[PDB]
Ligand SMILES: NC(=O)c1ccc[n+]([C@@H]2O[C@H](COP(=O)([O-])OP(=O)(O)OC[C@H]3O[C@@H](n4cnc5c(N)ncnc54)[C@H](O)[C@@H]3O)[C@@H](O)[C@H]2O)c1
Ligand SMILES: NC(=O)c1ccc[n+]([C@@H]2O[C@H](COP(=O)([O-])OP(=O)(O)OC[C@H]3O[C@@H](n4cnc5c(N)ncnc54)[C@H](O)[C@@H]3O)[C@@H](O)[C@H]2O)c1
Ligand SMILES: [Cl-]
């Protein structure tokens with residue numbers, strides 16, 4: 336019976352994400368929002384033989400109605416990268432978008448789980464938090480920077496190298512969602528996997544640079560869409576399952592954190608009826624992994640600060 | 650398990666269809682083909698943590714390697730309607746696309762199930778048949794015009810009207826895939842539903858005009874994509890399960906037929922290891938349904954001849 340909104344539903348991520356959500360018996364109502372094309376996307380999805388009632392909304396006049404009653408809001412709304420761009424190069428465009436949409440969430444569904452996909456995630460989650468604080472409704476257990484694609488990628492690449500079924504592989508990925516802030520904890524992988532350091536370093540780089548490589552492959556036609564839909568829906572399903580009282584649901588996500596000096600940071604989170612039930616910690620890590628954590632922290636702090644500073648201007 | 654090719658994989662249907670297939674444990678290898686953008690789509694999908702190996706192919710020089718060893722080929726390749734168009738306005742452009750692609754299938758994977766989505770289905774199926782005959786490999790039990798979206802719509806619409814879970818509703822839909830040739834057998838719906846004739850005729854028109862409704866709603870940005878991804882995947886899964894020896898698998902599809910004087914016709918089909926096991930036929934129909942079938946026959950015969958006449962020009 337979960338009521339889920341997708342903001343940016345007409346986009347590259349939004350459309351297949353909305354499909355996966357409509358296909359799920361976990362979703363009773365699916366409200367779709369965008370500044371273009373949403374009615375057509377809703378009409379299309381509405382024909383699918385599943386229970387979720389689909390409704391489309393177009394333009395800021397209609398946004399409040401999309402949000403009212405929502406249990407979960409997912410926000411792919413934003414501009415994606417061109418080849419040669421960094422995720423930070425998106426900040427100046429996507430800051431405003433996220434700020435405006437999350438302000439609407441704060442006003443119209445302040446109790447919803449808020450799942451931000453729009454890049455750069457390392458700054459857009461701090462923006463969300465500070466927007467919520469401005470409206471007097473910040474709950475740090477309910478705001479999530481979606482990093483699931485990093486984990487999905489780690490699982491796939493590990494499985495490939497060891498000839499495993501990726502369905503049975505779970506790699507914790509910590510830190511943030513840009514470059515060297517993406518920290519895959521291969522030492523914590525299940526099943527246990529042994530790589531010599533040369534191969535381990537290559538694998539870790541491949542995980543870190545995976546998004547950039549898809550941008551390159553699409554040659555100007557955007558970034559990861561279909562695999563993000565997959566990863567985004569996974570995260571939403573875990574969240575909703577947890578909200579329905581399912582036990583033992585764990586996902587990595589970039590959240591308000593006191594695991595390091597960074598005020599936001601991704602670790603495995605036990606999910607529950609209230610959102611974050613418990614931050615499970617970084618855990619025991621290798622020397623290689625500890626140095627990566629150490630190396631990432633300055634970049635993460637700078638990105639958090641940039642987001643916070645922007646909301647100060649609003 | 651199953652080796653599936655998607656011809657037209659970068660399109661509105663092709664991408665989310667490819668996602669749904671990648672997500673499925675029934676699929677061991679997914680080969681993607683298009684004249685544009687395929688390498689990036691394959692890169693994106695290859696990151697999802699499921700077993701299917703994904704490989705992208707671009708342009709006709711690469712089409713044979715996409716097709717070799719395939720068990721199923723799905724063909725969403727073609728141009729979609731704009732508002733105001735009939736499906737036959739697509740004939741000149743799609744007839745050639747389908748002829749060329751099915752000719753490559755006939756040559757490189759003649760044993761595969763061929764699942765045609767491209768419109769107008771009522772003509773593109775006969776095209777495929779005559780191309781396969783031209784190559785001396787026509788098997789009538791392995792060529793399918795995908796009408797599943799008409800069934801999916803009927804289930805959803807009946808479920809809405811009767812306050813039922815659409816997951817449990819099954820309406821047989823027969824005839825063809827255009828306008829009045831789409832014939833919903835509400836009299837054979839499970840569970841049994843009683844509509845007065847006024848609601849029945851309205852419901853039946855809604856089903857018939859549903860595609861046009863979605864083209865209208867999208868207002869120039871294409872036709873049904875996400876719902877067709879859903880319906881195409883459904884069909885492909887039914888086929889594959891049947892291929893793996895699952896019993897009692899029935900799907901309606903536009904196929905070579907002797908049920909009526911139309912040489913191609915959609916009825917419920919029992920699927921098995923060789924494609925079509927048994928055409929279950931029209932069955933018992935109401936007077937209202939009998940008249941629809943009767944009125945449809947001329948249009949269907951003219952569409953069949955149109956496709957056949959086209960292959961004569963090659
Ligand atoms: N977190 C991750 O792992 C991850 C992965 C891939 C992409 N991304 C990011 O997700 C974002 C979306 O990517 P995409 O490929 O869908 O791009 P897109 O350009 O294809 O779609 C963006 C959609 O957002 C909409 N939009 C823009 N401003 C809006 C507003 N103010 N209100 C409502 N809707 C608005 C657009 O109309 C469009 O439909 C990008 O910022 C991208 O970098 C994140
Ligand atoms: N059977 C049904 O119920 C049903 C439902 C909806 C749409 N359709 C039909 O499906 C077709 C696809 O619609 P869409 O929305 O994906 O359109 P689309 O225009 O978005 O995508 C079409 C794709 O086909 C590709 N393509 C074109 N020519 C090709 C060729 N010669 N070889 C390989 N690929 C080629 C394009 O490059 C593009 O990637 C249309 O004809 C549409 O009417 C059928
Ligand atoms: Cl980056």
Ligand SMILES: [Cl-]
Nearest residue numbers: 475476591611
């Ligand atoms: Cl917290």
Ligand SMILES: [Cl-]
Nearest residue numbers: 835842843844
């Ligand atoms: Cl009836």
